[PDB]
Design a protein around this ligand. Sequence first.
Ligand SMILES: [Ca+2]
Ligand SMILES: [Ca+2]
Lengths: 141, 141
Amino acid sequence: ENRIQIMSTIAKIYRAMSRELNRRLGELNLSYLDFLVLRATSDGPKTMAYLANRYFVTQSAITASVDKLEEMGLVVRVRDREDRRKILIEITEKGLETFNKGIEIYKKLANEVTGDLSEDEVILVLDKISKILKRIEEISQ
Amino acid sequence: ENRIQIMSTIAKIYRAMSRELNRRLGELNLSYLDFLVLRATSDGPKTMAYLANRYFVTQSAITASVDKLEEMGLVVRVRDREDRRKILIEITEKGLETFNKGIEIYKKLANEVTGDLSEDEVILVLDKISKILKRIEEISQ
Ligand SMILES: [Ca+2]
Ligand SMILES: [Ca+2]
């Protein structure tokens, strides 16, 4: 039925976008996950626990990505002044610059794939799947 | 912009559905990937190479899932009569029975998440994102 095919198509779209994004972001020395870590920290410091839960990846995966971004000088580990173990991952100026480039790549790709859709069509689909997202997130956790 | 948010929302939906599906399929002793292997072989034998490429997972991931399903008696490795190394993964009767149960779980979940959408709305969204899928697959590979 249709409700099943919408979710199944959403899944296939994600897999294909994941493959292509890892490919295009590769030129910025980033993996798709690395880019997500930058997107997440672009608007404020994030705990490593949040990163893992928000993007449904393992803790080691996040540790791996954070260490890499840190070595690359795109993020820094900030510790509380009184409790140095309270860690937050903060994006650096360089990190923001790279993130913005990642965004332009993401933007370009998005325009290509949604090419057969008009502005209004894009609008209709967006407003509706946002309902789906709201529900699954209420259900999943 | 909107074209960016459609792909980003599609991604979040997929992550949330992945988490919930692994949870619900867990009762059938299956992981989300295991279920995909069953879905893929439900309509005909598939090469392990195809499974890995179609669902964008590593070769070891597929090997792991196939061995598990094989132990569970849900799939079998069929070899060519003249070249025993030519392998195809064929679903078993038991595998089909389990797959069908997985489908009902998937179906139930899909109805819940798309609950705020009417039949027509589901239709509109489906016909449009199918265009997106067609393009990304043309682009990604
Ligand atoms: Ca809840
Ligand atoms: Ca091509």
